[PDB]
Design a binder for these strands. Structure first.
Ligand SMILES: CN[C@@H]1[C@@H](O)[C@@H](O[C@@H]2[C@@H](O)[C@H](O[C@H]3O[C@H](CN)CC[C@H]3N)[C@@H](N)C[C@H]2N)OC[C@]1(C)O
Ligand SMILES: [Mg+2]
Ligand SMILES: [Mg+2]
Ligand SMILES: [Mg+2]
Ligand SMILES: [Mg+2]
Ligand SMILES: [Mg+2]
Ligand SMILES: [Mg+2]
Ligand SMILES: [Mg+2]
Ligand SMILES: [Mg+2]
Ligand SMILES: [Mg+2]
Ligand SMILES: [Mg+2]
Ligand SMILES: [Mg+2]
Ligand SMILES: [Mg+2]
Ligand SMILES: [Mg+2]
Ligand SMILES: [Mg+2]
Ligand SMILES: [Mg+2]
Ligand SMILES: [Mg+2]
Ligand SMILES: [Mg+2]
Ligand SMILES: [Mg+2]
Ligand SMILES: [Mg+2]
Ligand SMILES: [Mg+2]
Ligand SMILES: [Mg+2]
Ligand SMILES: [Mg+2]
Ligand SMILES: [Mg+2]
Ligand SMILES: [Mg+2]
Ligand SMILES: [Mg+2]
Ligand SMILES: [Mg+2]
Ligand SMILES: [Mg+2]
Ligand SMILES: [Mg+2]
Ligand SMILES: [Mg+2]
Ligand SMILES: [Mg+2]
Ligand SMILES: [Mg+2]
Ligand SMILES: [Mg+2]
Ligand SMILES: [Zn+2]
Ligand SMILES: [Zn+2]
Lengths: 96, 129, 25, 206, 87, 120, 217, 97, 81
RNA sequence: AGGGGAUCGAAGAUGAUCAGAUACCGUCGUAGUCUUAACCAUAAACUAUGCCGACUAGGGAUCGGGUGGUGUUUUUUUAAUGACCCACUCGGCACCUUACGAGAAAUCAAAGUCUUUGGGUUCUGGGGGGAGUAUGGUCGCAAGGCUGAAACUUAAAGGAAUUG
């Protein structure tokens, strides 16, 4: 009979079972693990400033061939090296 | 084992009119089955039903015309207070005009329209249309 | 590779981890 | 409602029991037949013939309802029904189908066997179930010669004959063509046998 | 299918299966209408004067069309013997 | 491999259905007959058609052959039907089971009485 | 001219039967498009969707075209049929015709109150085709048709001005979407409501009363 | 998915059954799955009729017929014996022919 | 099927059904007053035996039990009630 | 850890085979295979399908029990048997036909009674991978069992059916 307990007094077993099961919901999990604040290069914030280490052209996956101008950046607030992409045409000549 | 007798009876009923049959044997009757069948009868979804006598809980033979689509039990007997009877109806009843949510109150087993006018509420029971 | 031999690979490798880690005790 | 006259006559009783129409099928019988009476020992069941005659009456009382008697349809694929339907057809209005049914007749207007009855008579609801299928798409009531084992699906006004063979097919066929004339047609008065022999409808090997 | 005051609206009040009292709708193509002719004294069948029934598609498919009409006609007077209401 | 195609047997089919009178079994009559009735653009085809519709005829006289009906046979069956000499009841009473008899007395009365037993 | 076959189809060329509603009443199997062409000429054709389908042929690659068409007017009748030709516009043509053979009565109704000229639906009806199930619920006046544009358009030619919708199954596959949407309203008359409890005499067949005006040569 | 409602062969309510080794390739196969044929033959054959009873004593002596039951592993079965491939439908037929 | 009388089913088709599954359950066993004229009078026995009975005076065998009704030993008469 | 140890036979030894052939096939043969005492707790441990309860449909077979029969065999002589037959009925291993219904489909008498959504209850799952990995706890003599994350990565993986 769809084994969820029907009882009028089964409230706990009902709300516990769903509490138990929201962990399968992914970014529910990521909410309560703090993963925003714990890992990931930004603090859990929109943007972050950093400093260019190197200018690295990345070759794109198939079925495309390009060299995608990128930058190794080290986050000021944070210290993590992180690798970011420069948009549009040239625009790598704006950094060094 | 057996948990809701009423549910068991409202079953073979729906299992009758889905097979076309005009007569269904139900066992082991009840006090509520009676009053529920009564409410069903009085609004015209069944014919006359006869509680027979064994010495245990009895049986019943229900005559059903075919005017019925679905009757059924609401399995946990839910507290509904007067302001949620509307809410409850709107879910399982085909359109505003007809059909009945039947429930149980301290004033006796009755539908929502009878409930409205007496203006008492209670725990939910079942539904008929 | 076959799930069973992949299973045996993972076991071979993980009995090697206790060894290398035992040496650390 | 019945007239006192049309209850089963011992002439018909002896006509019926001649062909062995009373004698039903073996260990296999579908539930849908109460028509059984007191199963015959060792592998037969005895049909109630007055209930068979009343059905025969109700068949005629229905066969002659349909305004134009010619687009009523009797059908037999069986060898044992093939002659019996022609004679039913020539006498009454009805147009027959004897032998292969050529499926696509009741639907598929572009077909050259296209028919459009208001009713259908069937000798063997098994072998002719093909038509019973077709009639179930087009809203066509259907009469069926039936034994005890026969597929009650999608047929009305069953008649409880013996479709196993010999004389029983055309017998119950002949009495039906007989009674449709005895209602709203030129023919015999009370107690009068029919000059047409019941053996007219029959099988020829030769 | 009435309205505010008076008038009957909503075209096509549909039939009903006489056997199961079920609405028989436009697309039910195993549904059937039986025309049984009412005869008169001396057996003549009176063309155009009918005892009619409607039979739903469901009843015919189940194999109940036979026993359904037998019940339906006999209590309407067109037969006796045959069908037993009790079994 | 001598086998007539469909354009030959369909012609031969539709010819005899409407033209069975005339159309004697003899080829050369039918062949010449074809030119005045059916239009065919080939010498050979006409002869191929003819020779087959010939065959249909030659067998038809021994009784029907499937696929073709000109309606003349249809009621030739109707009047060809007869020959019942002996229908049933004689010489004696109705031979019937124990139970079949038990049915009679239930719904009615008058029947001649003969009943024997059965088993196995 | 027309030149009908089909006893049902002949009887309407002569002026015997005035409207479709009696074809329904007797559950008559319309086998011809002209019947309902002439019975309700104010129909509109709407092509909905066209997608190509490709058979792998023992020699070849067959890419034909499948079209879906909803037809109807504003009142109680809608067709839905799906035709696939070897060319596009030809598939719409034979679709509108097959959609016409399909058309079906639609019982509108009053949401909560009697008042004027029904808008919403009789009851709650749920059609199911493939994975897609489509639920129609009564709505008040001015709620309008609440549904995707593709089911909305079929509920316009259906003549409903007010209905709520819930959609289940994979609704991006249109054939089963509408096919279930069409079955929902196509079920509206299968619901035996108490105002329809009233006893009715069972009228007799226009194929009978006009029997001689029908039939053959 | 399921190619049979008999699964391999013929155990419902049993849950284990002793196996048997194949006569040909000696593969272990369960006895209910064993796909067996009964091999009965005269110790003689077609060509042996005449040279037998005439080179004997006795008024014909009649004749013994060999008996052993054969079991096959379904891999070597299909390689040779009564086996092979049936349409999805015909696979349902259980009759010998 | 599809219509039948549940209230008034045939006693002939009833008596084929199981003792529990009839319209009202009741036992189908009986009681017989059994006689060994070696005794002037009767001891009244239940039909399905279990205990294999003796007559009040002498040690003697009326029945021996089986799963169902008992084997009534050799000559005896019986009255059902 | 004792006994046992015929046969078959992971390791290993080999003869052939292949371009190679640590294999397939042939041959020897250790542990094993059996058993007593203690451990281990896993298998596609499968019906890949929770348990209790109600209901929803025909058909012939079959297992065990029970009821009926001026039924057949045995005979020694009715009997009592004992098997057989026929019918009914419970409880079982299954099977056929169906499809009112269900479903993505293959198919399902349940996988049916579901948007007309509620009989009671247990368990699990929430894209693929990373991974049944790391770690901690715990069980084991050991192999291992149990519980069991994340970082990162990725647009599909996937089911049934269709045509080639
Ligand atoms: C065979 N395993 C099944 C699994 O397939 C599934 O089964 C459901 C079943 O529980 C639902 O059924 C359930 O809900 C019904 C409500 N209408 C009534 C009660 C119950 N049988 C079915 N409607 C659909 C199946 N696939 O969920 C339950 C289960 C036991 O795990
Ligand atoms: Mg917890
Ligand atoms: Mg957790
Ligand atoms: Mg998990
Ligand atoms: Mg911050
Ligand atoms: Mg670098
Ligand atoms: Mg809701
Ligand atoms: Mg290893
Ligand atoms: Mg060290
Ligand atoms: Mg488009
Ligand atoms: Mg809106
Ligand atoms: Mg496979
Ligand atoms: Mg297997
Ligand atoms: Mg196992
Ligand atoms: Mg040892
Ligand atoms: Mg050894
Ligand atoms: Mg080696
Ligand atoms: Mg190789
Ligand atoms: Mg090789
Ligand atoms: Mg060896
Ligand atoms: Mg298994
Ligand atoms: Mg099971
Ligand atoms: Mg498992
Ligand atoms: Mg199962
Ligand atoms: Mg798991
Ligand atoms: Mg992920
Ligand atoms: Mg695990
Ligand atoms: Mg995993
Ligand atoms: Mg594991
Ligand atoms: Mg661990
Ligand atoms: Mg311990
Ligand atoms: Mg430890
Ligand atoms: Mg991409
Ligand atoms: Zn093998
Ligand atoms: Zn004594």
């Amino acid at each position: 009979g769809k084994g969820k307990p029907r009882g009028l007094n089964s409230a706990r077993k009902l709300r516990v079972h769903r509490r138990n099961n929201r962990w399968a919901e992914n970014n529910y999990k990521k909410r309560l693990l703090g993963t925003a604040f714990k890992s990931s290069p930004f603090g859990g914030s929109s943007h972050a400033k950093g400093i260019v280490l190197e200018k690295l052209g990345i070759e794109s996956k198939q079925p495309n061939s390009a060299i995608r101008k990128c930058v190794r950046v080290q986050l000021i607030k944070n210290g993590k090296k992180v690798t970011a992409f420069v948009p549009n045409d040239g625009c790598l000549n704006f950094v060094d | 084992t057996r948990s809701s007798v009423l549910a068991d009876a409202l079953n073979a009923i729906n299992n009758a009119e889905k097979t076309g049959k005009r007569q269904v044997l139900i066992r082991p009757s009840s006090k509520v089955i009676i009053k529920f069948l009564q409410v069903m009868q009085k609004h015209g979804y069944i014919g006359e039903f006869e509680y027979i006598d064994d010495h245990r809980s009895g049986k019943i033979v229900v005559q059903l015309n075919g005017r019925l689509n679905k009757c059924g039990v609401i399995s946990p007997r839910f507290n509904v207070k007067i302001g949620d009877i509307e809410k409850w109806t709107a879910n399982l009843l085909p359109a505003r005009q007809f059909g009945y949510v039947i429930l149980t109150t301290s004033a006796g087993i009755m539908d929502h329209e009878e409930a409205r006018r007496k203006h008492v509420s209670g725990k939910i029971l079942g539904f008929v249309y | 590779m076959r799930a069973k031999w992949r299973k045996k690979r993972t076991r071979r490798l993980k009995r090697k981890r206790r060894k290398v880690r035992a040496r650390s005790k | 409602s019945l007239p006192a006259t049309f209850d089963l006559t011992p002439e018909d009783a002896q006509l019926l029991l001649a062909a062995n129409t009373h004698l039903g099928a073996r260990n296999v019988q579908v539930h849908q037949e109460p028509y059984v009476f007191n199963a015959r020992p060792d592998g037969v069941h005895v049909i109630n013939v007055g209930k068979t005659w009343e059905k025969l009456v109700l068949a005629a009382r229905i066969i002659a309802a349909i305004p134009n008697p010619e687009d009523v349809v009797a059908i037999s694929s069986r060898t044992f029904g093939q002659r019996a339907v022609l004679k039913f057809a020539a006498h009454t209005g009805a147009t027959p189908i004897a032998g292969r049914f050529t499926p696509g007749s009741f639907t598929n207007y572009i077909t050259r066997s296209f028919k459009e009855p208001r009713l259908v008579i069937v000798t063997d609801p098994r072998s002719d179930a093909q038509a019973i299928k077709e009639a179930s798409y087009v809203n066509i009531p259907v009469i069926a010669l039936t034994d005890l084992d026969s597929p009650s699906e999608f047929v009305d006004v069953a008649i409880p004959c013996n479709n196993r063979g010999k004389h029983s097919i055309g017998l119950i066929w002949y009495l039906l063509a007989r009674e449709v004339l005895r209602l709203r047609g030129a023919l015999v008065d009370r107690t009068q046998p029919w000059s047409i022999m019941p053996d007219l409808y029959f099988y020829r090997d030769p | 299918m009435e309205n505010d005051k008076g008038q009957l609206v909503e075209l096509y009040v549909p039939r009903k299966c006489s056997a199961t009292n079920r609405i028989i709708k436009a697309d039910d193509h195993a549904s059937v209408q039986i025309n049984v002719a009412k005869v008169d004294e001396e057996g003549r069948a009176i063309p155009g004067e009918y005892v009619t029934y409607a039979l739903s598609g469901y009843v015919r498919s189940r194999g109940e069309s036979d026993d359904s009409l037998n019940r339906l006609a006999q209590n309407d007077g067109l037969l006796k013997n045959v069908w037993s209401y009790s079994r | 491999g001598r086998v007539r195609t469909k354009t030959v047997k369909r012609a031969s089919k539709a010819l005899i259905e409407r033209y069975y009178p005339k159309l004697t079994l003899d080829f050369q009559t039918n062949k010449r007959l074809c030119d005045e009735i059916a239009t065919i653009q080939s010498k050979r085809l006409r002869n191929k058609i003819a020779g087959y519709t010939t065959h249909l005829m030659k067998r038809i006289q021994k009784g029907p052959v499937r696929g073709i009906s000109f309606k003349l046979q249809e009621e030739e069956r109707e009047r060809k039907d007869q020959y019942v000499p002996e229908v049933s009841r004689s010489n004696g009473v109705l031979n019937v089971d124990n139970q079949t008899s038990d049915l009679v007395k239930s719904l009615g009365l008058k029947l001649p009485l003969s009943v024997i037993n059965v088993s196995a | 001219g027309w030149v009908p076959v089909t006893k049902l189809g002949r009887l309407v060329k002569a002026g015997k039967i005035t409207t479709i509603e009696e074809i329904f009443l007797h559950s008559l199997p319309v086998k011809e498009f002209q019947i309902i062409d002439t019975l309700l000429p104010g129909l509109q054709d709407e092509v909905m969707n066209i997608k190509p389908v490709q058979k792998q042929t023992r020699a070849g690659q067959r890419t034909r075209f499948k079209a879906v068409v909803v037809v109807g007017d504003s009142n109680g009748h809608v067709g839905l049929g799906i035709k696939t030709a070897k060319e596009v516009a030809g598939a719409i043509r034979a679709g509108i015709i097959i959609a016409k053979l399909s058309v079906i009565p639609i019982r509108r109704g009053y949401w909560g109150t009697n008042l004027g000229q029904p808008h919403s639906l009789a009851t709650k009806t749920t059609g199911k085709c493939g994975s897609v199930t489509v639920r129609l619920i009564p709505a008040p006046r001015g709620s309008g048709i609440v549904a995707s544009p593709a089911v909305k358009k079929l509920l316009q030619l259906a003549g409903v001005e007010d209905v709520y919708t819930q959609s289940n199954g994979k609704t991006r596959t249109l054939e089963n979407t509408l096919k279930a949407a069409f079955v929902a309203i196509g079920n509206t008359y299968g619901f035996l409501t108490p105002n329809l409890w009233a006893e009715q005499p069972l009228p007799v067949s226009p194929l009978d009363i006009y029997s001689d005006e029908a039939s053959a040569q | 998915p399921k190619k049979r409602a008999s699964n391999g062969r013929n155990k419902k309510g049993r849950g284990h059954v002793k196996p048997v080794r194949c006569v040909n390739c000696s593969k272990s196969i369960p006895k209910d799955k064993a796909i067996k044929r009964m091999a009965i033959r005269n110790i003689v054959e077609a060509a042996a009729v005449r040279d037998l009873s005439e080179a004997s004593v006795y008024p014909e002596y009649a004749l013994p017929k060999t008996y052993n039951k054969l079991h096959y592993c379904v891999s070597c079965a299909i390689h040779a014996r009564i086996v092979r491939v049936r349409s999805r439908e015909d696979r349902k037929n259980r009759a010998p022919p | 099927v599809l219509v039948q009388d549940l209230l008034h089913p045939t006693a002939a088709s009833e008596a084929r059904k199981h003792k529990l599954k009839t319209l009202v359950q009741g036992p189908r066993s009986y009681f017989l007053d059994v006689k060994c004229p070696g005794c002037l009078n009767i001891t009244t026995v239940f039909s399905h035996a279990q205990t294999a009975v003796t007559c009040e005076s002498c040690s003697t065998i009326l029945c021996t039990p089986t799963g169902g009704k008992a084997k009534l030993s050799e000559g005896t008469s019986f009255r059902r009630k």
